[PDB]
């Protein structure tokens, strides 16, 4: 679902524009592929420690 207020404002545009419907506004979260935090990143865009030995 949309969060409560956003949903209330999407149903007021419909009725203002004249659209009459009983369908729910819903977010397509099928595109969003949530990867784990422990997923291998790119080491070819990562930096290296500078040469200042102590």
């Amino acid at each position: 679902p949309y969060p409560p207020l956003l949903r209330a404002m999407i149903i007021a545009e419909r009725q203002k524009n004249g659209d009459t419907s009983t369908e729910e506004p819903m977010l397509n979260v099928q595109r969003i592929r949530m990867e784990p935090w422990d997923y291998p990143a790119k080491q070819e865009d990562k930096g290296r420690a500078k040469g200042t030995p102590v």
Partner: protein, 119 residues
């Protein structure tokens, strides 16, 4: 001013005098000062309750949706004000801190009860 790296963020800019805090929601550069230069002001938040007993939070939804579609991040306090309004979902830690307070207050009812019962 030009900053190395950085991004835009919708945060709170503290204002007001001592013991009278007033925040004003602004969209500003990440590296800029808290109360420094801002791109736009998107609202205000008054923490202190008023005579009627309510906290006022002004939100320019139209402009908040614009800067979020341009690459603006959100601060945790501002993500918790949008969850209470219904624009965003309740922040996970708002749900977890409410559960911790329940367990805590349920732990205090036992001690209080025992005292009145045993003594």
């Amino acid at each position: 001013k030009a900053y190395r790296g950085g991004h835009l963020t919708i945060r709170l800019a503290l204002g007001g005098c001592t013991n009278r805090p007033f925040y004003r929601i602004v969209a500003a550069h990440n590296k800029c000062p808290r109360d420094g230069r801002f791109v736009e002001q998107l609202g205000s938040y008054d923490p202190l309750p008023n005579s009627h007993g309510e906290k006022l939070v002004a939100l320019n939804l139209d402009r908040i949706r614009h800067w979020i579609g341009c690459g603006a991040h959100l601060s945790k306090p501002m993500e918790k004000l949008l969850g209470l309004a219904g624009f965003f979902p309740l922040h996970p830690m708002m749900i977890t801190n409410a559960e911790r307070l329940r367990r805590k207050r349920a732990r205090e009812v036992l001690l209080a009860s025992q005292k009145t019962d045993a003594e």
